[PDB]
Each structure stands twice: as C-alpha cells, then as structure tokens.
Amino acid sequence: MGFFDRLKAGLAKTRERLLKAIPWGGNLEEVLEELEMALLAADVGLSATEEILQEVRASGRKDLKEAVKEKLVGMLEPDERRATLRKLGFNPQKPKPVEPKGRVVLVVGVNGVGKTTTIAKLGRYYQNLGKKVMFCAGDTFRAAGGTQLSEWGKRLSIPVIQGPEGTDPAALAYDAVQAMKARGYDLLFVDTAGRLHTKHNLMEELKKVKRAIAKADPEEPKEVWLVLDAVTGQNGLEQAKKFHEAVGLTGVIVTKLDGTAKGGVLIPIVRTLKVPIKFVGVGEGPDDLQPFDPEAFVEALLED
C-alpha cells in the first residue's frame, strides 16, 4: 500500500520548500535560524516554534535533528499514555486502527471542508475493519453541490438515514440512533450542517443534534470529530474553537494536506484544541484518508 510513501507524497509541498534543505551539518546559529524559518513557513506558528527552539537549544542533548523530531512528535500527541508507550519504544510498523470510543460519531465542520467525502472514506475504512456502518445525512438544509452523502451510501452499500430538505436535523439524528440500535449497527456517522451565516445559528443547531443523540442513547455520542481543511491553515482554528466550545470535540480530521505547503498546521491545531488528530487526508483516493501517526508524520515533514 506504500502507506509511508503516500504520506511523504502528501507532505511534499510542505517539506520541499525549506525543511528538507536544512543544513544539519553547519554551526548552530545557521542551522537554528534555518530551522525556525522552516517551521514558521510551514505554519507551525510562533508559539510552537519558539518552544521547539527552547526545547532543542538548552535541552535536547542528543542529536539536534533527533531532538527536533522528538519535540515535534511530542507536540502532536495529546494523550500522555500513548506518549509514554512511544518513549518506552512502542513503534509498530502500521499505525494502530482508530477505534471510536462509542457507537455514534458526530461529524462537524464548516460547509466545504469535505465532511461528506470524509464520512464516505470513513465508512469504507470501518467496513474494511468488519464494522457494520450507518450514515445520517444531517446537513438537510442543503443539496450539497455534487455527490450527496445518500449517493455515497448507495455506492458503499451503507444505509443512510435521511429526510426531505428542511427536516428537523435533531429529529433525524434521533431516528438514526434508534435505527442503529434496533438494527444492530456498530457505528453511526452523523453528518451536520456547516453554514455559519444562515437564519439558524449553527452552534445552537449542533448542540440540539447532540442533545437528540443523547436522548436516544444517553452515553452518545462518544466521539465528536471536526473536519478541517489544511489548505485553510490557521483560519479554520478560530472557528474550530467555537465548535469545540459548543459540542466538545474528541478529535480532528485534517484533509487536503497534499494541496498546501502549510502542513505544519497540525501542531498548533493539537496545542490549541488539545484533542488528537484522528486521520489525515493525503490525497483524494479512497485509501488516502490515513489514520494519524505522529511519528510517521514528523518523519515525512523532514525526510525525503
């Protein structure tokens, strides 16, 4: 599958401007300067960059390069546990599969970041893992230009809970969870509206949908994942903060890394939202939505 080479390819635009050219053999002054410039130019942001230079300078008395990688990877792991295991030497070839904490995943994000396409790729990912998957077409206030989630469901043989344009999205989500439960489904992906400037406040609508999910199943949704487009950069972060404050994210999916030189944005994303990156979109293929691996990510940022 060339998992690792696919990621390197997806991060090529980001890496080939400055990162891979850093003169790791010169005197400190030069190499530190080039490193800071490369990090800033990749959208790592000043805060995170300044911290790296501090962690690698005074501290980090192993190989400079090795130090850098270690700090970048550390910034990308919100979970202390997995970070500990990593330090203990835990480094499997294939990144362990992402397992949703519960049966329902509420998918959120602004209109156009790729929520529909992402859910389709997730449906495939989880079907291949043997899960029985269901979709709920929550964005019922629009005819999502292009391929509707309903059409993707037919292509993948995944049932799609849906209603006429304008249907109460909370009521739809409740029906989907009941159907998921009644029909013995392992996972339900609830798509949601993404337009921030309509007659219906978006955050209020999402909170209503989440409430409805919980009403049908008191423990759900155990995952709330925000989809963010890498191309957008640090812009999709202020908004991300609002989604987090309204519905409580448990994870982030970053798409279209291959279309920007700003792939370092995943660092500020994790430091700001303090939730894990679940998958990364490295291309537009069905298997181009890869489960995130901090170590592999950082290696691809700086190598090849």
Numbering used by the authors: 1 to 304
Task: Pull text from the paper.
The functional core proteins of the signal recognition particle (SRP) and the SRP receptor (SR) (called Ffh and FtsY in bacteria) contain GTPase domains and form a distinct subfamily of GTPases. These GTPases mediate cotranslational targeting of secretory and membrane proteins to the endoplasmic reticulum (ER) membrane in eukaryotes or the plasma membrane in prokaryotes. SRP GTPases are unique in that activation of GTP-hydrolysis occurs upon formation of a complex of two GTPases. Here we report the structures of two conformations of FtsY in complex with the substrate analogue GMPPNP.
In addition, apo crystals of FtsY pre-derivatized with chloromercurial nitrophenol (CMNP) were grown and solved by multiple wavelength anomalous diffraction (MAD) and used as a molecular replacement model for the apo/GMPPNP dimer forms. Finally, in the ground state apo FtsY, the position of the guanine specifying Asp258 is further extended than in F1 or F2. Interestingly, the interaction distance between Lys256 and Asp229 is maintained but the interaction with the the P-loop is decreased by more than 1 Å. In apo FtsY, the IBD has re-structured and as a consequence Arg142 and Gln148 have returned to the active site although their positions differ from the active form. In addition, Gln148 has rotated clockwise (from the same reference axis as above) greater than 2 Å from the active position to locate itself again out of the active site but in the opposite relative direction than in F1 and F2. In apo FtsY Arg195 is positioned away from the phosphate-binding cavity. The preceding glycine, Gly194, forms a salt bridge with the P-loop and orients the backbone nitrogens away from the γ phosphate.
